[PDB]
Design a protein around this ligand. Structure first.
Ligand code: CL
Ligand code: CL
Lengths: 53, 79, 92, 64, 226, 41
């Protein structure tokens, strides 16, 4: 029961950790794409304000 | 900490842009504009998880809150 | 004391090891839950930002330089933009 | 005899306890690593939220 | 290294606490510190006014050196736990199985039953023979000298606390007509050697708890007595 | 080689010819428990 318990705990932790890392990796790349998208909007607003000027 | 960090980096900026010839001329006239002492604030600025009483404290985030307010206050004063 | 049976100590101390794995399972769950709750909280903000970023793209494409008039009422009748000034204190 | 079996029993015990400590170590250093990552994500996200507020205000009228 | 680092941490912690401890019983006054009023209450004179700028910096240094090394020692726990267990086992088995042969031979070769009984009890308590059984074909166990080699096993597990207590106490009784005068020169030094070195075994086996006890600065805040 | 080491070698010449531990450990262990109780007080 000891061996079985050690193996089980290690497994469930390994699985949940891997999932958490995957979640953080996805959220990072989300912000990376969003910054790129915000930057292009900002450039577009800059261009527009200059045209009015 | 945030107060002295902002004051430190403002003095650094002011020193960096101060005309070098004027600096030496003042030194010869016996009125040296005293160069600020260097400090070691970076490790504190890199702290994202200070473990205190079971809490995880983002020191970087907290400093930024104040430093950003100080930047805005500087700009308001200039205008 | 010291008079206990060897095999009896072995079994009791192995049973306590399984208890340690029980508490370690609870300790692990708490750790993963605290991290999940923060990242989950970020998800709501990320989704809410992504939609704001997308409907701004639309609003920005529809800007017309030839059309846009400049109003002096933006100075006298409407407030100046202020960015968030919220600061965290009393963290304990 | 029973002492020789005791030595084997306690070696086994030593191996399991060592492995439990390794799990605990991993759990602590995983927590710390994710704390950094969540702080970094919050930093970038907060900035991106602020920037959007700003850009929006450049295109929108103020409150009367 | 494990023992050296624990001793160093202990030295540093003792330094901080001893300075602090001294200051608490010798609060300053106006005569020794010009900035300290006679109106200042004892505790403030014991703490706040009782340290110069240089003393306060030096204290934070040592505190930082303690806590910093505590982190590095803690990160090395798993390696230390294994190496300590291997070393303690090896020292105990080498001593019991091999080193105690000569004094045991001399205990049976002469009529020294009391010394024989304790030396055997020690061997009985801890010896982890590789075959599983004690070697009975041993010349020293009989009384005569060697033409004899024993391969001692290597395990990464220390003795139990009862095993260590019994061995140490039984070895102690030999070196304490006393049982000491009935033993040879080099052998007495051999028991003393192992008895002295085994003093720290419990501490080192319980490394984690010992680490914390060597770095304990928790008492600087408490002030119930004052 | 110290003087007491030389004197001890001479002492050797004048010398030539021509269990309960479990109980004590139980007493010791019992007394230790009192220490822990005293700490609590
Ligand atoms: Cl704590
Ligand atoms: Cl002892």
């Amino acid at each position: 029961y000891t061996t079985q318990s050690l193996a089980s705990v290690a497994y469930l932790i390994n699985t949940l950790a891997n999932n958490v890392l995957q979640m953080l990796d996805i959220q990072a790349s989300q912000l990376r794409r969003m910054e790129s998208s915000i930057n292009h909007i900002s450039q577009t607003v800059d261009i527009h304000k200059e045209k009015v000027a | 900490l945030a107060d002295q960090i902002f004051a430190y980096y403002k003095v650094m900026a002011g020193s960096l842009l101060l005309d070098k010839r004027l600096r030496s001329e003042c030194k010869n006239q016996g009125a040296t504009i005293h160069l600020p002492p260097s400090n070691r604030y970076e490790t504190l600025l890199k702290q994202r998880h200070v473990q205190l009483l079971g809490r995880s404290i983002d020191l970087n985030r907290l400093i930024t809150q104040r430093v950003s307010a100080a930047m805005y206050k500087s700009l308001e004063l200039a205008i | 004391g010291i008079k206990n049976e060897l095999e009896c100590v072995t079994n009791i101390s192995l049973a306590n090891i399984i208890r340690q794995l029980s508490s370690l399972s609870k300790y692990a769950e708490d750790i993963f839950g605290e991290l999940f709750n923060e990242a989950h909280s970020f998800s709501f903000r990320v989704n809410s930002l992504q939609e704001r970023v997308d409907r701004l793209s639309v609003s920005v494409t529809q800007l017309d330089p030839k059309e846009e008039e400049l109003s002096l009422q933006d100075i006298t009748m409407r407030k100046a933009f202020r960015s968030s000034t919220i600061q965290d204190q009393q963290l304990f | 005899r029973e002492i020789h079996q005791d030595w084997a029993n306690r070696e086994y015990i030593e191996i399991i306890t060592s492995s439990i400590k390794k799990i605990a170590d991993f759990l602590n250093s995983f927590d710390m690593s994710c704390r950094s990552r969540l702080a970094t994500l919050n930093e970038k996200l907060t900035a991106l939220e602020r920037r959007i507020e700003y850009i929006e205000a450049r295109v929108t009228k103020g409150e009367t | 290294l494990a023992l050296q680092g624990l001793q160093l941490l202990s030295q540093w912690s003792a330094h901080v606490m001893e300075v602090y401890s001294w200051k608490l019983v010798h609060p300053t006054d106006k005569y020794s510190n010009k900035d300290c009023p006679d109106s200042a209450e004892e505790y403030e004179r014991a703490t706040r006014y009782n340290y110069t700028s240089e003393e306060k910096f030096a204290l934070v240094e040592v505190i930082a050196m303690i806590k910093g090394l505590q982190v590095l020692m803690g990160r090395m726990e798993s390696v230390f736990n294994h190496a300590i267990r291997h070393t303690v086992y090896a020292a105990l088995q080498d001593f019991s199985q091999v080193t105690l042969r000569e004094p045991l031979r001399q205990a049976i070769k002469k009529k020294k039953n009391v010394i024989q009984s304790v030396l055997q009890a020690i061997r009985k308590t801890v010896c982890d023979w590789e075959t599983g059984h004690e070697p009975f074909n041993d010349p020293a166990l009989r009384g005569e000298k060697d033409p004899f080699d024993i391969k001692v096993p290597r395990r990464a597990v220390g003795p139990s606390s009862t095993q260590l207590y019994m061995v140490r106490t039984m070895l102690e009784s030999l070196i304490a007509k006393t049982l000491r005068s009935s033993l040879e020169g080099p052998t007495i030094l051999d028991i003393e050697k192992f008895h002295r070195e085994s003093f720290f075994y419990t501490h080192l086996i319980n490394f984690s708890e010992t680490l914390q006890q060597c770095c304990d600065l928790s008492q600087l805040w408490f002030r119930e007595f004052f | 080689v110290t003087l007491e080491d030389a004197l001890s070698n001479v002492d050797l010449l004048e010398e030539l010819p021509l269990a309960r531990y479990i109980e004590q450990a139980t007493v010791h262990s019992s007394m230790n428990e009192m220490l822990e109780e005293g700490q609590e007080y």
